[PDB]
Swiss-Prot record, chain A:
It comes from Homo sapiens. This is Protein transport protein Sec23A. It is a peripheral membrane protein. InterPro entries: ADF-H/Gelsolin-like_dom_sf (IPR029006), Gelsolin-like_dom (IPR007123), Gelsolin-like_dom_sf (IPR036180), Sec23 (IPR037364), Sec23/24_helical_dom (IPR006900), Sec23/24_helical_dom_sf (IPR036175), Sec23/24_trunk_dom (IPR006896), Sec23_24_beta_S (IPR012990). The gene is SEC23A. CDD domains: Sec23-like (cd01478), Sec23_C (cd11287).
Swiss-Prot record, chain B:
One of its GO terms (biological process) is retrograde vesicle-mediated transport, Golgi to endoplasmic reticulum. The modification N6-acetyllysine is found at residue 33. It comes from the Eukaryota. It comes from Mus musculus. GO terms for cellular component: COPI-coated vesicle; endoplasmic reticulum membrane; endoplasmic reticulum-Golgi intermediate compartment membrane; ER to Golgi transport vesicle membrane; Golgi membrane; melanosome; SNARE complex; synaptic vesicle. SNARE involved in targeting and fusion of ER-derived transport vesicles with the Golgi complex as well as Golgi-derived retrograde transport vesicles with the ER. Belongs to the synaptobrevin family. This is Vesicle-trafficking protein SEC22b. Residues 1-137 are cytoplasmic.
UniProtKB/Swiss-Prot annotation, chain C:
Belongs to the SEC23/SEC24 family. SEC24 subfamily. The lineage of its organism: Eukaryota, Metazoa, Chordata, Craniata, Vertebrata. COPII is composed of at least five proteins: the Sec23/24 complex, the Sec13/31 complex and Sar1. Interacts with TMED2. Interacts (as part of the Sec23/24 complex) with SEC22B; recruits SEC22B into COPII-coated vesicles for its transport from the endoplasmic reticulum to the Golgi. Interacts with STING1; promoting STING1 translocation to COPII vesicles in a STEEP1-dependent manner. Interacts with TMEM39A. Interacts with SACM1L; this interaction is reduced in the absence of TMEM39A. GO terms for molecular function: SNARE binding; zinc ion binding. Changing residue 187 to A: Decreased ability to interact with and package the SNARE SEC22B cargo into COPII vesicles. Has no effect on other cargos packaging. This is Protein transport protein Sec24A. It comes from Homo sapiens. It is found in: Cytoplasmic vesicle, COPII-coated vesicle membrane; Endoplasmic reticulum membrane; Cytoplasm, Cytosol.
Length: 699, 137, 731
């Protein structure tokens, strides 16, 4: 079963390819419609793999240096092995002298195609957490934010270093645990500082006066966080607070850059409004002028965006080069400036949380999900990840789309046609989780093509770890090329990988015109039809859902930005460019469940016909979970039905990291609009009919 | 949306209490004293004067004039609520000694209540007649 | 009395055994009995020369010396609904006006007749005309703004050197003891700043568990970090400022900050006070070396270096002018053990009506003298009265013109002195000249007046008026000369000659002041003949030339000399005389010739001895009143009754090396010397410490540096000085 194959490979290797069978010829590699690409999840969880405590064993060839993998030919008699990538024959290291065929290395069993090594050579650095807190917000929001950070403090590792930076009109770098005082370094939030200047102006496991071990500082920081008060500067009438977010971040970046560069650190920024002063300003302090919209930016009526986006863009590259993570937690009724600040959590592995207020269960729960621990009590987060990809000599890499930064590492596996963050075989991922999914786009220039994923990152324990996923896919049979190719098509993975390419081009500007010429080209090459007969068009069970995915993608909020705020549009694309396949599908085509007396809950189409008056609906967009009551039900058996979707909702409410917004609406309710807008050129019926007219006519 | 508060005895214009903070004050403090001079027993007990980019607001109770200046953008509704809080407190504390004093600023120590009350109005988070000032002068 | 001529070469002990008294102007009995108290206001020539040509002939300087804010035993405070001021020159109605029509009075300064208002009513019995010293209530027109509150900002150096001296522990202790005694009502504000390489503000809020130390590190671009609780209400926040004073000395024990950014810190302290003004107490302990206003090190001179003063930068002068325009006065407490360029740092106190305090080589353990000195000088500093946002005008009768001002202030419009603060321990001096011949008048008057805001928030005007007669005879000018006042004015004039020219020219002009006057006196009459009023004139000029301000052949260091010149410019005349020529008494044998009128105290009155070792005696003990200190030198062969009954010691050898004060023993010999000393310090508010340390071998015999009549390896004796003058008088 080709589906059993795709399932188990994602369960084992955390990867999903657009095509599981690759073009064996130059004429088919150039005529590829959906590119050969992979939805790679470097830290995916699974059924208790054994952590390999010995050295990885690498190939002895300067340019290659691939890791010993199940695709390597062994020779237990001669204690040799041939690297499957460069054909180089290798000798076994001394620790492998007792190697035998009845007792072999884990890295050779096909069960351990994806495996994790631990390198224990240098002393382990502590983790670093830098709270960057805005103070220009209402007391109920600030007190709630104070309570959220005091709780996260009680979960950090005792070895972890902590710093505190509060800001409003001025920026305050706190010197922790000073005794009898509790001083702080105050800076103007009006001019920027480099790392060097900041280092000059400011001054066994290491630490600073500003970054200190939790175990020795937690009691003083939990009292400081409890005594934090709003920005003491007054806000005159008709004015926004002077909020220096752009400088407060550049001081949090420069602080760690000149104290602990190239080590896992988390810059957690808490925003209660837009940056109204200094570099990285979003909007002026005049309440008369509203924050910019998608209408304002298209009509050249947003004088702060480009200058503001450019500021945080350099900050993102600074922290990404230094290897530090920038989180952004925004909760305000107006907009916040995520459009201008998106590069910081996007280029690093930073999280981006959005809400109306820090005083909601939405934020409070979402925030403590950041510090979820696994079966040992350690955070599900890794730091400073370096992803290197080894390919066969026939496979080049166009690039990646996802939370990563190019290390600009040159090599024969770099493709001329670069895609996304391309032109490199190594990518830095400052922060990642078991969910972090990259999108690698390959290009081809008996059997088996091979690709190896090597990910060295800093574990939440401080240990240096190396994840090695080695996958192999058959080369297409020459006398059955396109027939074998078509049978391996993963229509779900290809829809997300083609959606990744589109949103990346939109967020870096038509895009729909490209998205259609490829759906049409896929229809003609892999569909069944008589020419000029639209009624004849069918798709295999392998391709039948791809057009429907394209229908819901081209109309999604990821490409139709209007009727959303720019902060919402940047927030939606942020989480899509990071999630795995299954959650990405839920974003583009929300799931719909029906509830009625006439049977147990059942999934239903995302069409207006699914909305019945005597039926309760559950819609699962990734960002929001919605419950709808038809006109009739809007009034022990009535209890089971009314709470049947509520019980189903509570489960998925918890596991999802960015806790989705819950909605309880009914017929006529104002909140029913979210259901009516995801549902239904016009509809799918007209879209499919117009698609068949172009598929059966000229190419 | 800034400050200037003067409390004077209407009969002579004798300054009783005031409050000023800069970091000009010289011009509008003159017009303020020109006004205290012209004020008599027939002047409007509540008024508002337009001084270009600035605007005066005063009330009168018990022969005591409570004057405030600010930028014209400041809510006139709030300015009179500010003067009302000053008067009720000032009258409660020094209402019966106003007609006896003869020194200027015989109630400087009212500086305290003026500025702690002033801050509750020059911060949006904390939460009659009109004539151009150049005429009356 | 004496119109008599004195041959200084034959007398030789012309110094009286009793204290000098200021001359009485040759005035009518009824005019003089109302004249201004000479402690508050006096003139070098109590008989004003009628013409400038006569003044030039006498070769004596004409000028005034005033102590206008001096603490008074009794002050008439007039609350007049109307202040009577001459309609032309604005002179206040003073006792020396000329009432004629009993409803019109003639101004004694510009001779204009003015109408007495129907309030002033016998108008000549009015208090404004019966007192030369009187304080007014200024009406609403004498204030540019509401009465500013009393604001005190203390700026502390906390560098490594400053932490080693240990001054911060005693200063914070003084403030704790004198918190309720700071002048001010419930409007009093207080602030605190520490600084090294960075500037440290201290916020104080009742809502927070402890103060907060806000540090601005941008030294080239300082700012105020918090808008509300840096200058806090002392009355409301008494508990908060007390915990900070108990905590501040402990915060910097392990400091490695070797540099000091005084300039930036003063700029930050200025911005914090610029809204209101007040008194800025700066405590610096070293050369400022970081940031704006940085000063280069200088190599100290030795006895060999000749007379080859000025500031090295105008930064602290420009900054002082900015503080003056905002009613901010800066007092400079310098406790440096090394050179700190006080010639440049002093500008912060001179041009802002502040006072500089100098404690060389201060150390909490090593220098117990400077410790107790600072303790008592701070006790006065924090508790003396104070006036804020003040100006002062010096008026004199038409024909006389003031052309040079001396003291700590800023001079705005000729005769307009800016006093951001005014303190009762400051002294001022003026130099005048006869611009128009006084042929018309036989009396001239001089008026100074002090418009200030009291510590209680009341505009007041303290006015002093002095009247003097006019003469046209060379001998009449000499007969009214004030030898002490001329010495004071000449000291101020020589300080300017130093900065302006050099220490050599300053010393020459002093020497020429005696030569030219006595040569002019001789040409108007064998030995050295001087009038009775100028018999101490070479003695006091000699002591001036051996004082630490103008001495040459000594090992004196730069900041010592600069501070000595700062004290000349800022102290009243009494303290300049007590320093330049200290009073020397023998104290091991006090008896009953004293002022035993004071109820139950006898208080001996030993004679004043002249400043020569030839007056000492190894058999006795000698106390020297230097004004600010009381050094008790003891003889090696001293008596045994003195040791055990006064010093509490059984022999000269076991007199402790540093002795901070006398014991109060159950002996009548001690009761006598304690009575004499306690009476000496009651003559002044500045409590003077008394250290007996002057043994015959304590290496602290700077007691002998005041024996100005003797000769040294690089200065003339008093007799040699007369010999040099006489060769010049009749050259
Ligand atoms: O211009 C003036 O002289 C009047 C204001 C200054 C002043 C006040 C009081 C006393 C002396 C001087
Ligand atoms: Zn290899
Ligand atoms: Zn006059």
């Amino acid at each position: 079963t080709y589906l059993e194959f795709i399932q188990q490979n994602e369960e084992r290797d955390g990867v999903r390819f657009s095509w599981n069978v690759w073009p064996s010829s130059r004429l088919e590699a150039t005529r590829m419609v959906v590119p050969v690409a992979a939805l790679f999840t470097p830290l995916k969880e699974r059924p208790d793999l054994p952590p390999i405590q010995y050295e990885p064993v690498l190939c002895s060839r300067t340019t290659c240096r691939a890791v010993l993998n199940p695709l390597c030919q062994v020779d237990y008699r001669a204690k040799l092995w041939a690297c499957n990538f460069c054909y180089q024959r290798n000798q076994f290291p001394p620790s492998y002298a007792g190697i035998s065929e009845l007792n072999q290395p884990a890295e050779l069993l096909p069960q351990f195609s994806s495996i994790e090594y631990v390198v224990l050579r240098g002393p382990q650095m502590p983790l670093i957490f830098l709270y960057v807190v805005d103070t220009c917000m209402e007391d109920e929001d600030l007190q709630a934010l104070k309570e959220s950070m005091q709780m996260s403090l009680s979960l950090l590792p005792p070895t972890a270093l902590v710093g505190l930076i509060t800001f409003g009109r001025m920026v305050q770098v706190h010197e922790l645990g000073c005794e009898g005082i509790s001083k702080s370094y105050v800076f103007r939030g009006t001019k920027d500082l480099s790392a060097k200047q900041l280092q000059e102006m400011l001054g066994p496991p290491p630490s600073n006066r500003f970054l200190q071990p939790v175990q020795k500082i937690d009691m003083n920081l939990t009292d400081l966080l409890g005594e934090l008060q709003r920005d003491p500067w007054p806000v005159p009438q008709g004015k926004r607070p002077l909020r220096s977010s752009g400088v407060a971040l550049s001081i949090a970046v420069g602080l760690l850059e000149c104290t602990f560069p190239n080590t896992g650190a988390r810059i957690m920024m808490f925003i209660g409004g837009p940056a109204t002063q200094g570099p990285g300003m979003v909007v002026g302090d005049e309440l008369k002028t509203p924050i910019r919209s998608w209408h304002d930016i298209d009509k050249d009526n947003a004088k702060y965006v480009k200058k503001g986006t450019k500021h945080f863009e350099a900050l993102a590259n600074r922290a990404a080069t230094t290897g530090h993570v920038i989180d952004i937690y925004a909760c305000a009724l107006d907009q916040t400036g995520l459009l201008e600040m998106k590069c910081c959590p996007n280029l690093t592995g930073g999280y981006m949380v959005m809400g109306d207020s820090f005083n909601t269960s939405l934020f409070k729960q979402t925030f403590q999900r950041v510090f979820t621990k696994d079966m040992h009590g350690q955070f599900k987060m890794g730091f400073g990840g370096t992803l290197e990809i080894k390919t066969s000599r026939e496979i080049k890499i166009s690039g990646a789309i996802g939370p990563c930064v190019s290390l600009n590492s040159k090599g024969p596996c770099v493709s001329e046609n670069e895609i996304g963050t391309g032109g490199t075989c190594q990518w830095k991922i400052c922060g990642l989780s078991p969910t972090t999914t990259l999108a690698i786009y390959f290009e081809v220039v008996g059997g088996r093509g091979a690709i190896q994923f090597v990910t060295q990152y800093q574990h939440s324990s401080g240990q240096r770890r190396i994840r090695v996923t080695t996958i192999a896919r058959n080369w297409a049979d020459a006398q059955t090329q396109i027939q074998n190719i078509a049978a391996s098509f993963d229509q779900e993975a290809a829809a997300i990988l083609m959606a990744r390419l589109a949103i990346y081009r939109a967020e870096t500007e038509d895009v729909l015109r490209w998205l259609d010429r490829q759906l049409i080209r896929l229809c003609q090459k892999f569909g069944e039809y008589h020419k000029d007969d639209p009624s004849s068009f069918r798709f295999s069970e392998t391709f039948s859902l791809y057009p429907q995915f394209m229908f819901h993608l081209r109309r999604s909020s990821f490409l139709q930005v209007f009727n959303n705020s720019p902060d919402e549009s940047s927030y939606y694309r942020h989480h899509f460019m990071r999630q795995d396949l299954t959650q990405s599908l839920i974003m583009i085509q929300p799931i719909l469940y029906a509830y009625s007396f006439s049977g147990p809950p059942e999934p239903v189409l995302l069409d207006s016909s699914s909305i019945l008056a005597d039926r309760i609906l559950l819609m699962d967009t990734f960002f929001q979970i919605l419950i709808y009551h038809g006109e009739t039900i809007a009034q022990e058996n009535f209890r089971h039905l009314l709470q049947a979707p509520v019980d189903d909702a509570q489960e998925i409410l918890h596991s999802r990291f960015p806790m989705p917004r819950y909605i309880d609406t009914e017929h006529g309710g104002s909140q029913a609009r979210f259901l009516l807008s995801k549902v239904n050129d016009v509809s799918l019926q007209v879209f499919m009919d117009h698609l068949k007219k172009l598929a059966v006519s000229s190419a | 949306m800034v400050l200037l508060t003067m409390i004077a005895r209407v009969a002579d214009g004798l300054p009783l209490a005031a409050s000023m903070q800069e970091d000009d004050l010289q011009q509008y403090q003159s017009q303020a004293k020109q006004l205290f001079r012209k004020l008599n027993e027939q002047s409007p007990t509540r008024c508002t004067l337009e001084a270009g980019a600035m605007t005066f607001h005063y009330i009168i109770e018990q022969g005591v004039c409570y004057l405030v200046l600010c930028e014209a953008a400041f809510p006139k509704k709030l300015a009179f609520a500010y003067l009302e809080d000053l008067h009720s407190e000032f009258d409660e504390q020094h209402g019966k000694k106003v007609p006896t004093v003869s020194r200027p600023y015989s109630f400087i120590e009212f500086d305290t209540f003026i500025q702690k009350t002033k801050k509750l109005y020059i911060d949006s988070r904390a939460r009659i007649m009109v004539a151009n000032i150049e005429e009356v002068l | 009395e004496g119109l008599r001529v004195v041959n200084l070469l034959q007398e030789r002990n012309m110094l009286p055994s009793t204290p000098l008294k200021p001359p009485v102007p040759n005035l009518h009995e009824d005019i003089q009995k109302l004249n201004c108290n000479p402690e508050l206001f006096r003139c070098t020539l109590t008989s004003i020369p009628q013409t400038q040509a006569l003044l030039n002939k006498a070769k004596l300087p004409l000028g005034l010396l005033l102590h206008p804010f001096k603490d008074l035993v009794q002050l008439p405070v007039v609350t007049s609904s109307t202040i009577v001021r001459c309609r032309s020159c604005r002179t206040y109605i003073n006792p020396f006006v000329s009432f004629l029509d009993q409803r019109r009075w003639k101004c004694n300064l510009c001779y204009r007749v003015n109408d007495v208002p129907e309030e002033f009513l016998e108008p000549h019995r009015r208090p404004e005309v019966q007192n030369a010293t009187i304080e007014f209530m200024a009406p609403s027109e004498y204030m540019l703004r509401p009465p500013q509150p009393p604001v005190y900002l203390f700026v502390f150096d906390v560098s490594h050197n400053a932490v080693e001296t240990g001054y911060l522990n005693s200063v914070c202790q003084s403030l704790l003891d004198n918190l309720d005694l700071l002048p001010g009502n419930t409007r009093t504000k207080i602030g605190f700043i520490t600084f090294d390489s960075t500037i440290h503000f201290y916020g104080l809020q009742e809502s927070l568990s402890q103060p907060q130390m806000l540090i601005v590190s941008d030294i080239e671009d300082v700012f105020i970090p918090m808008p509300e609780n840096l200058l806090v209400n002392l009355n409301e926040s008494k508990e908060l400022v007390q915990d900070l004073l108990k905590t501040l000395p402990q915060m910097f024990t392990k400091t490695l900050e070797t540099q000091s950014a005084l300039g930036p810190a003063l700029q930050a302290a200025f911005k914090l006070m610029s809204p209101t003004g007040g008194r800025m107490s700066v405590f610096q302990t070293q050369l400022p070396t970081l940031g704006v206003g940085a000063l280069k090190p200088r190599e100290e001179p030795n006895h060999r270096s000749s007379a080859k003063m000025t500031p090295s930068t105008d930064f602290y002068k420009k900054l002082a002018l900015d503080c003056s325009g905002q009613q901010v006065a800066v007092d400079l407490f310098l406790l440096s053990g090394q050179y700190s360029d006080l010639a440049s740092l002093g500008c912060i106190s001179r041009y802002s009506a502040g006072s500089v305090y100098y404690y060389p080589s201060y150390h909490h353990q090593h220098n117990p003298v400077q410790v107790q000195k600072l303790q008592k000088e701070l006790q006065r500093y924090l508790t003396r009265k104070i006036g804020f946002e003040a100006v002062m005008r010096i008026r004199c009768t038409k024909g006389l013109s003031i052309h040079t001002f001396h003291g700590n202030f800023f001079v705005r419009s000729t005769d307009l002195l800016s006093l951001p603060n005014v303190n009762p321990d400051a002294g001022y001096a003026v130099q005048m000249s006869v611009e128009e011949s006084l042929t018309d008048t036989q009396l001239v008057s001089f008026q100074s007046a002090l418009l200030y805001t009291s510590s209680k928030g009341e505009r007041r005007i303290r006015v002093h008026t002095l009247c003097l007669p006019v003469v046209s005879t060379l001998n009449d000018v000499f007969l009214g000369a004030d030898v002490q006042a001329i010495s004071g004015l000449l000291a101020n004039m020589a300080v300017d000659r130093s900065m302006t020219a050099s220490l050599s020219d300053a010393r020459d002009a002093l020497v020429n002041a005696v030569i030219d006057s006595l040569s002019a006196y001789r040409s108007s009459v064998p030995g050295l003949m001087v009038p009775f009023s100028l018999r101490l004139f070479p003695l006091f000029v000699l002591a001036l030339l051996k004082q630490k301000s103008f001495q040459t052949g000594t090992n004196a260091r730069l900041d010592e000399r600069i501070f000595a010149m700062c004290q000349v410019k800022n102290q009243p005349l009494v303290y300049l005389m007590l320093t330049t020529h200290p009073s020397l008494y023998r104290v091991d044998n006090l008896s009953d010739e004293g002022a035993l009128n004071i109820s139950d105290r006898t208080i001996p009155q030993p004679p004043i001895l002249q400043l020569s070792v030839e007056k000492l005696s190894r058999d006795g003990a000698f106390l020297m009143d230097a004004g600010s200190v009381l050094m008790l030198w003891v003889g090696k062969n001293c008596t045994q009754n003195f040791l055990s009954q006064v010093l509490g010691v059984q022999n000269y050898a076991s007199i402790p090396q540093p002795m901070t004060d006398l014991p109060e023993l159950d002996t009548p010999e001690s009761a006598r010397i304690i009575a004499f000393i306690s009476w000496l310090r009651e003559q002044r508010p500045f409590f003077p410490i008394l250290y007996v340390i002057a043994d015959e071998s304590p290496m602290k015999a700077n007691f002998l540096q005041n024996m100005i009549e003797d000769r040294t390896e690089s200065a003339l004796s008093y007799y040699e000085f007369l010999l040099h003058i006489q060769q010049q008088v009749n050259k």
